[PDB]
Amino acid sequence: MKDGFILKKKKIPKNIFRIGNKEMSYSDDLNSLIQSQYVSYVVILDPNGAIYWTNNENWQVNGSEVLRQWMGSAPSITVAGTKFSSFRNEPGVSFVGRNMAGGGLIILQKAPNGYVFLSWTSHEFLTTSGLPPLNIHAEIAMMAAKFQ
């Protein structure tokens, strides 16, 4: 049933979800992608649009909404209870969301198959994200755009 469901959200989640409950990377296997300019966590998805693994003390990439919510004309994505308010609004070509709360920025590239790559740059390195023109962003909108 395809409804014309346009849910107007406030910049907070509708339900209080239980964060992840998934293992934590001890920094090695997927860390190789996180060490790319010293970001704090990167989440890789599967070609179907499901997560491979998210590694941020239970950060809940619900791939389906993580990829979908950006297509809701929303300049704020609220995942894991945090409203990432967009710096740059580019659908598909990577969007940069501000952790309006918490402090930081989530950058997600969207391969049109479901696979999205969200990276997050440290709150300490936040002043550095945006200092070079495309420091961390280059690792995202290039790689996951080709790998679809």
Ordered by where they begin, the domains of the chain are: 31-146 (3.30.450.30)
- What distance in Å separates the CA atoms of residue 122 and residue 29, rounded to the nearest whole number? 19
Structure tokens at 47: 């070609």
* Residue 69: φ, ψ to 5°: -65, -25
Task: For the beta carbon of residue 120, count every other beta carbon within 10 angstroms.
Answer: 25
In the numeric block, the tokens 């550095």 are attached to 128
* Residue of 80, 66, 79 whose CA lies nearest to 19: 80
Handedness of CA 92, 107, 32, 27 (dihedral sign): negative
C-alpha 98/C-alpha 103 separation (Å) is 7
Beta bridge partners of 127: none
Residues 40 and 24: beta-carbon distance below 8 Å: no
Cβ pair 108, 40 in contact under 8 A: no
